[PDB]
Design an enzyme around this catalytic site. Structure first.
Site, PDB file in Angstrom:
ATOM      1  N   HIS B  60       0.859  -1.220   0.000  1.00 23.87           N
ATOM      2  CA  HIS B  60       0.000   0.000   0.000  1.00 23.87           C
ATOM      3  C   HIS B  60       0.886   1.258   0.000  1.00 23.87           C
ATOM      4  CE1 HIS B  60      -3.377  -2.683   0.515  1.00 23.87           C
ATOM      5  NE2 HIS B  60      -2.903  -3.133   1.676  1.00 23.87           N
ATOM      6  N   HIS B  86       5.206   7.392   5.854  1.00 24.10           N
ATOM      7  CA  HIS B  86       4.916   6.635   4.620  1.00 24.10           C
ATOM      8  C   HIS B  86       4.574   7.661   3.533  1.00 24.10           C
ATOM      9  CE1 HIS B  86       0.830   6.791   6.490  1.00 24.10           C
ATOM     10  NE2 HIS B  86       0.567   7.223   5.237  1.00 24.10           N
ATOM     11  N   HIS B 111       3.328  11.409   4.989  1.00 25.55           N
ATOM     12  CA  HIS B 111       2.543  11.364   6.241  1.00 25.55           C
ATOM     13  C   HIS B 111       3.451  10.864   7.348  1.00 25.55           C
ATOM     14  CE1 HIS B 111      -1.451  11.037   3.811  1.00 25.55           C
ATOM     15  NE2 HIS B 111      -0.950  12.266   3.834  1.00 25.55           N
ATOM     16  N   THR B 192      -6.807   7.672   5.971  1.00 21.55           N
ATOM     17  CA  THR B 192      -7.116   7.690   4.520  1.00 21.55           C
ATOM     18  C   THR B 192      -7.004   6.273   3.962  1.00 21.55           C
ATOM     19  OG1 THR B 192      -4.863   7.955   3.802  1.00 21.55           O
ATOM     20  CG2 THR B 192      -6.141   9.992   4.300  1.00 21.55           C
TER      21      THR B 192
END
Ligand SMILES: COC(=O)CCCNC(=O)c1cc(S(N)(=O)=O)c(Cl)cc1SC1CCCCC1
Ligand SMILES: COC(=O)CCCNC(=O)c1cc(S(N)(=O)=O)c(Cl)cc1SC1CCCCC1
Ligand SMILES: [Zn+2]
Ligand SMILES: [Zn+2]
EC number: 4.2.1.1
Lengths: 251, 251
Positions: B60, B86, B111, B192
């Site tokens: 991800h 990340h 982030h 998110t």
């Protein structure tokens, strides 16, 4: 613990010696205008007469326990449930509000204590950011009997004794607060009683609530507290902001 | 779960259909200026070369695990510890930031995920107000190679495969962030990614960080996700504010 002597509150609870404590002196000229502060929203505060509520002389205050379904929002996504309200007051010719404005102490002060909907129980919320929210309003003398307050004040005789309680019919709890939900101060502070846990969001209304001289006399008072002492002057000294900035919903 | 892996996230996780989700479109003109928002304090972010840090392709994002001792404050008594950072990014000249500014999507977004010091565990913090705080900065194209970002981009080759991971030398995490810690937007929203938990305080820097075109290409071209697919466009769609007012630290 008690007001006006020992034990020191920090022996009771170390958090009573935290840097960011309540109550505080509001200096509106040092307040920060934040237009993100919208009018407060209360739902479910207009109660039917039954079931009755419990009104208690706990020796520190007179406390009304609120039932489930009183919803309060500080804004979108900032949701709370009301648990209880209680009062702080002085003595014949002595003000006893907790919060002060430019050093002025008002006759008395109401607190409506709420729990963040992210928490099932108060003790999980204590010390957590935004876990508890209190709505605070000053009580001052007006020309009329306050009929909402009369329903509690007319019952203090029944609960004069420390640790006594009575039942009272449901009423419009929001009638115990100012009508203006738009103009208020907001800062981050603590319980004003042990355990003085931080992370509490304090809302203090611009507008005051009006009681008759007789009503304010009834409140100071009629109750007795720890020992053969009158329950009076049940307020904590003003605590320094220590770099916190009070916000205001108005310029 | 996957990015554009229809069916939609709300089935995997129905918190993803909450009213107060992230990310959002920032419209600076509609932001509320509050002089109460003070400069971010970030202490302990200057890491020595040893010990090394886990850098991992979780399919991800690329995630850097941060050690204990990275202390951050959003205000007085409002403290956090950094857990990880990340990135979110696009593809071959398609921008991939999660927040937009007046509809502008930026090439990428960093982030830095923090845990409130009032919470022992992340899983206690999920869903609670202020439990988690993310520092978010936009990555734009500039003429120069970014020193700080080279340290991470130079290592993506080694972890191109979903699930793979490497140790990297300690680095100044604060060097990954913009110049002016006094200039940010702030609002409350959600992860998110699933599980899309609400109560996250988002701080988005006004100023950007610049990477070279080679560097931005490296970020989006080097990693593989689930299936035999590129780890690209790993960003969620813009979510409605639903009454939330975005705050700004500057007039
Ligand atoms: C039997 O004697 C008592 O219960 C004394 C407790 C008095 N304190 C409160 O009721 C109280 C006051 C505030 S305040 N003045 O800051 O608004 C608040 Cl925010 C919460 C509570 S109740 C709390 C105190 C003990 C821990 C959990 C419940
Ligand atoms: C490890 O890969 C996964 O399967 C889960 C997805 C990864 N998501 C995150 O790492 C994550 C992202 C954000 S964000 N994009 O809003 O800033 C945040 Cl705030 C936290 C986390 S980690 C969190 C997620 C699930 C619970 C444990 C920690
Ligand atoms: Zn009180
Ligand atoms: Zn992220």
């Amino acid at each position: 613990w008690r007001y006006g002597g020992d034990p020191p509150w920090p022996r009771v609870s170390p958090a009573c010696a935290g840097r960011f404590q309540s109550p505080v002196d509001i200096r509106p000229q040092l307040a920060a205008f934040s237009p993100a502060l919208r009018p407060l929203e209360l739902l479910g505060f207009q109660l039917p007469p039954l079931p009755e509520l419990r009104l208690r002389n706990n020796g520190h205050s007179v406390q009304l326990t609120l039932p489930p379904g009183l919803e309060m929002a500080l804004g979108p996504g900032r949701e709370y449930r009301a648990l209880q309200l209680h009062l702080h007051w002085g003595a014949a010719g002595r003000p006893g509000s907790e919060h002060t404005v430019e050093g002025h102490r008002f006759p008395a002060e109401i607190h409506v204590v709420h729990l963040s909907t992210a928490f099932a129980r108060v003790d999980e919320a204590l010390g957590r950011p935004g876990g508890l929210a209190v709505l605070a309003a000053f009580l001052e003398e007006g020309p009329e009997e306050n009929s909402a307050y009369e329903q509690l004040l007319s019952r203090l005789e029944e609960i004069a004794e420390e640790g006594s309680e009575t039942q009272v019919p449901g009423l419009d709890i929001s009638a115990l607060l100012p009508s203006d939900f738009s103009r208020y101060f907001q800062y981050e502070g603590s319980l004003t009683t042990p355990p003085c846990a931080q992370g509490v969001i304090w809302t203090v209304f611009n507008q005051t609530v009006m009681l008759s001289a007789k009503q304010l006399h009834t409140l100071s008072d009629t109750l007795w507290g720890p020992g053969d002492s009158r329950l009076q002057l049940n307020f904590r000294a003003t605590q320094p902001l220590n770099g916190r900035v009070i916000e205001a919903s108005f310029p």
